[PDB]
């Protein structure tokens, strides 16, 4: 009985290996393909951005702003309270690097004409709808749906930040 069942067991373990690989084939096929793991993957920037400026980028089919939030701007956004925003978001809470604010650039609320790289209340301001923006990309005037969306940016080292 042991010999016969040993034949059976070794057959079954072989089939288990084969079936695991065959199933993983299809499952990995459904997963993210190579291209979406190449363009939608991280799109690390450099230090091509001076102080105050905001270098435009196009990552994950969405604009990216990397405005070099200077010390003064950090002071204004830290002084400005949170409840004044429609959505309370503290400057340091949403921006873990005060000198570099990382923000996906899309005017919320059907994109009614913003003003980019310049703002009454900061570095951006959106006057079409009551949508004045902050230098840290926070809604200032008018209860716009949200602030300027911030992605998951990771500063690995100097001039090396990987984002979405």
């Amino acid at each position: 009985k042991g010999f016969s069942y040993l034949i059976t067991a070794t057959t079954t373990v072989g089939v288990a290996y084969a079936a695991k690989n065959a199933v993983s084939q299809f499952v990995s096929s459904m997963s993210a393909s190579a291209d979406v793991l190449a363009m939608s993957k991280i799109e690390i920037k450099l230090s091509d951005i001076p102080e105050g400026k905001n270098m435009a980028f196009k990552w994950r089919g969405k604009p990216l702003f990397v405005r070099h939030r200077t010390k003064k701007e950090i002071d204004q956004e830290a002084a400005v309270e949170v409840s004044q925003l429609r959505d309370p978001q503290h400057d340091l809470e949403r921006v873990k690097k005060p000198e570099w604010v990382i923000l996906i650039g899309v005017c919320t609320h059907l994109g009614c004409v913003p003003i980019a790289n310049a703002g009454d209340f900061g570095g951006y301001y959106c006057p079409c709808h009551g949508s004045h923006y902050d230098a840290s990309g926070r809604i200032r005037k008018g209860p716009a749906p949200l602030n300027l969306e911030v992605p998951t940016y990771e500063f690995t080292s100097d001039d090396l930040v990987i984002v979405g």
Binding site: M30, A32, S33, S40
Partner: protein, 379 residues
Amino acid sequence: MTNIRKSHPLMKIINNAFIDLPAPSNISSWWNFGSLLGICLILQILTGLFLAMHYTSDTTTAFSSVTHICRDVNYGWVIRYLHANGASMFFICLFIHVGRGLYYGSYMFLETWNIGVVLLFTVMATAFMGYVLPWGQMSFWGATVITNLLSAIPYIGTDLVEWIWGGFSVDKATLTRFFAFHFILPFIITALAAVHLLFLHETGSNNPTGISSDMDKIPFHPYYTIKDILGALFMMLILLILVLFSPDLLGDPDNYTPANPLNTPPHIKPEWYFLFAYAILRSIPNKLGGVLALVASILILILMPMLHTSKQRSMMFRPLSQCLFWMLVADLITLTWIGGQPVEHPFIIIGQLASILYFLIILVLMPITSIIENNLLKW
């Protein structure tokens, strides 16, 4: 020598399932819907196939393909709006079928009941994925929200949503795989419907009185064929009224805008037949709690044969049970309306109360009421 109808193998099955099947002679019009659903299924399989011959599933050309269907194909608009409003009619008939099951105590047919629950889940999945193909604003954003819902699952959740998306956000891969799954699923629904009928035929059917009608059965063919034909004619009347007089009555106009992923629509409500579920999700503050309540709203139909305590199978002889059943129907309507409306001050509390009342009626009110029922009848 012998009748082919009852000697030929295939004809034997057809005879025993549609011709000489002993059906109760007093089943009301509520029993017609089981036919209509099947016919609707056929129609959905049919028109959709004719939609598949001019629809190309791709981000840069899905919406243009649909608008070319409705604007340049001979009678493309008829097929397209037939399909959309036929899906809506499919869900109307499905809800009425489940209501008939709840009312007249048909869940004592446990095998058929569970197969019906599986069919229900499959149909909701099929319709959800089908709504994504037009690649409109509501399509894209509703798909985004409903797939992000799965992120609440602990541990594996984010991996699950990125696997479903086929990437990092709803995009080309999601559209293509949704089209393929949308093609495959209704045939699985058809197989499950065949299993549903097979399970049902062994126990006959449930007449409204809830008593065994073995002493009154009548042949199916002479009577219920014409009854179901009349019912299907009525359903076609309603469906064609919808298609030819107000096509987009049950539809969000914003779906006629190409999906722009940079602009969130002011409203992101799903299709009308999902709001009753969606509202439940918005009731629970917790994300995982929301998903669990969402799933449990449908899954609670499985518990019904265990929660039946009254000694009468039906409900026509149980007035207080009828009052609770209609309270439950009103609650479902309230949930649909709440899901339609935004999540603001007058609606949050109403949705919470509606969801609590729905679960409480199904689990608590009805069994205790049936206990009182039996006590009142001295048994």
